[PDB]
Design an enzyme around this catalytic site. Structure first.
Site, PDB file in Angstrom:
ATOM      1  N   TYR A  58      71.845  15.502  64.383  1.00 29.75           N
ATOM      2  CA  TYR A  58      72.452  16.767  63.832  1.00 29.75           C
ATOM      3  C   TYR A  58      72.993  17.657  64.928  1.00 29.75           C
ATOM      4  O   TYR A  58      72.828  18.925  64.826  1.00 29.75           O
ATOM      5  CB  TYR A  58      71.462  17.520  62.952  1.00 29.75           C
TER       6      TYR A  58
ATOM      7  N   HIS B 168      62.238  12.114  57.891  1.00 30.31           N
ATOM      8  CA  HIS B 168      62.189  12.526  59.324  1.00 30.31           C
ATOM      9  C   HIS B 168      60.779  13.005  59.559  1.00 30.31           C
ATOM     10  O   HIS B 168      60.261  12.845  60.635  1.00 30.31           O
ATOM     11  CB  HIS B 168      62.898  13.867  59.535  1.00 30.31           C
TER      12      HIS B 168
HETATM   13  N1  LIG Z   1      60.269  19.399  59.576  1.00 31.80           N
HETATM   14  C1  LIG Z   1      61.361  19.959  58.993  1.00 31.80           C
HETATM   15  N2  LIG Z   1      61.468  21.052  58.567  1.00 31.80           N
HETATM   16  C2  LIG Z   1      62.639  21.385  58.196  1.00 31.80           C
HETATM   17  N3  LIG Z   1      63.881  20.770  58.113  1.00 31.80           N
HETATM   18  C3  LIG Z   1      63.615  19.502  58.529  1.00 31.80           C
HETATM   19  C4  LIG Z   1      62.454  19.219  59.122  1.00 31.80           C
HETATM   20  N4  LIG Z   1      62.758  17.929  59.251  1.00 31.80           N
HETATM   21  C5  LIG Z   1      64.212  17.490  59.357  1.00 31.80           C
HETATM   22  N5  LIG Z   1      64.606  18.614  58.610  1.00 31.80           N
HETATM   23  C6  LIG Z   1      66.025  18.869  58.154  1.00 31.80           C
HETATM   24  O1  LIG Z   1      66.363  18.249  57.094  1.00 31.80           O
HETATM   25  C7  LIG Z   1      67.875  18.156  57.014  1.00 31.80           C
HETATM   26  C8  LIG Z   1      68.290  16.674  56.689  1.00 31.80           C
HETATM   27  S1  LIG Z   1      70.111  16.178  56.210  1.00 31.80           S
HETATM   28  C9  LIG Z   1      70.588  16.810  54.544  1.00 31.80           C
HETATM   29  C10 LIG Z   1      70.621  18.358  54.571  1.00 31.80           C
HETATM   30  C11 LIG Z   1      70.788  18.781  53.015  1.00 31.80           C
HETATM   31  N6  LIG Z   1      69.800  18.786  52.221  1.00 31.80           N
HETATM   32  C12 LIG Z   1      71.866  18.164  52.392  1.00 31.80           C
HETATM   33  O2  LIG Z   1      71.572  17.520  51.657  1.00 31.80           O
HETATM   34  O3  LIG Z   1      73.136  18.395  52.855  1.00 31.80           O
HETATM   35  C13 LIG Z   1      68.355  18.037  58.490  1.00 31.80           C
HETATM   36  O4  LIG Z   1      69.374  19.287  58.467  1.00 31.80           O
HETATM   37  C14 LIG Z   1      67.256  18.424  59.075  1.00 31.80           C
HETATM   38  O5  LIG Z   1      67.182  19.650  60.224  1.00 31.80           O
END
Ligand SMILES: Nc1ncnc2c1ncn2[C@@H]1O[C@H](CSCC[C@H](N)C(=O)O)[C@@H](O)[C@H]1O
Ligand SMILES: CCN(CC)Cc1cc(Nc2ccnc3cc(Cl)ccc23)ccc1O
Ligand SMILES: CCN(CC)Cc1cc(Nc2ccnc3cc(Cl)ccc23)ccc1O
EC number: 2.1.1.103
Length: 258
Positions: free
Chosen positions: A11, A124
């Protein structure tokens, strides 16, 4: 935590812009605006409703939910660089806020939200972390509330090949089956748990995206490198191949509190 890892790998600003090129403006996941319209098609909200988006990214989901319903949207994303981009797109709209924070350390009141919404973000999180999130999510939903999720899933590990294991390892994903995922939600006390393997549809989205990339590759190279093009082309090819052979799966989950 995975903050500096995510901010400095998947990202990055460049990485996020590339994703936007292929998903559309304000989106960094599967099917952009079009898939979002489908996922929300049976969802009912009003102007007074309160929405939480977990892993809100560039904010496209929050913007659409506010546009369609007039609802209060609150997005949480762990990447500060992504949050800053999103904030700059909703400066005029006081019913759309984003906040840089790990959703796991984030604190919310009980019975707060009409809709808790997450698109391709919970992969994640480690297995343990998926559990505490959903327990927190349960608290956060109002009694009339709905949880709504898409997320990357997979076949059992004995069916992964070396390349898929490496991808999951280097991205630091935790991928479980649609069934194992549905199991967690019931264990976290949710009712009316609905699970669907949407991999056929996901494969259609990936195909449109892949074709779009090749059709517009001259415009792509105008903005990015050939290295970033090959990488993206290659990655979509593999997601397409792997959803076809049932190794990588797209899970949909919809649940309530009562
Ligand atoms: N523990 C956590 N807390 C908050 N956000 C998180 C996280 N782990 C990953 N993410 C976030 O989850 C996102 C996934 S990508 C998809 C982003 C959005 N929902 C869309 O569909 O476009 C990323 O921006 C990442 O930063
Ligand atoms: C650049 C923005 N674009 C990519 C082409 C967004 C985008 C649109 C689509 N197109 C579609 C999404 C959902 N349902 C669809 C149904 C039909 Cl009959 C045709 C296209 C669809 C797929 C993926 C995707 O990312
Ligand atoms: C020589 C062949 N090697 C290069 C080291 C290719 C190779 C590619 C990958 N990348 C990938 C494998 C499976 N799905 C993927 C999905 C995406 Cl979005 C991106 C990369 C993927 C992983 C290991 C690997 O060995």
């Amino acid at each position: 935590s995975d903050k500096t890892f995510l901010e400095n790998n998947q990202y990055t600003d460049e990485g996020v812009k590339v994703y936007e090129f292929i998903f559309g403006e304000n989106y960094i996941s599967s099917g952009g605006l079009e898939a979002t319209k489908k996922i929300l098609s049976d969802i009912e909200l009003n102007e007074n409703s309160k929405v939480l988006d977990i892993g809100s990214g560039l904010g496209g989901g929050c913007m659409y939910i506010n546009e369609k319903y007039g609802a209060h949207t609150h997005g949480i994303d762990i990447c500060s660089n992504i949050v800053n981009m999103a904030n700059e797109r909703v400066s005029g709209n006081n019913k759309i806020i984003f906040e840089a924070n790990d959703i796991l350390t984030k604190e919310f009141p009980e019975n707060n939200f009409d809709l808790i919404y997450s698109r391709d973000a919970i992969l994640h999180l480690s297995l343990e972390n998926k559990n505490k999130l959903f327990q927190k999510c349960y608290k956060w939903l109002k009694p009339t509330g709905t949880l709504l999720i898409t997320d990357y899933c997979a076949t059992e590990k004995e069916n992964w090949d070396d390349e898929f294991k490496e991808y999951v390892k280097q991205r630091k994903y935790t991928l479980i089956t649609v069934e194992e995922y549905a199991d967690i939600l019931t264990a976290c006390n949710f009712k009316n748990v609905v699970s669907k393997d949407l991999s056929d549809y996901w494969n259609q989205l990936l195909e449109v995206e892949h074709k779009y990339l090749h059709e517009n590759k001259e415009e792509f190279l105008k903005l990015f490198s050939e290295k970033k093009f090959i990488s993206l082309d290659d990655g979509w090819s593999r997601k397409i191949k792997d959803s076809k052979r049932k190794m990588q799966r797209w899970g949909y989950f919809k649940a309530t509190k009562n």
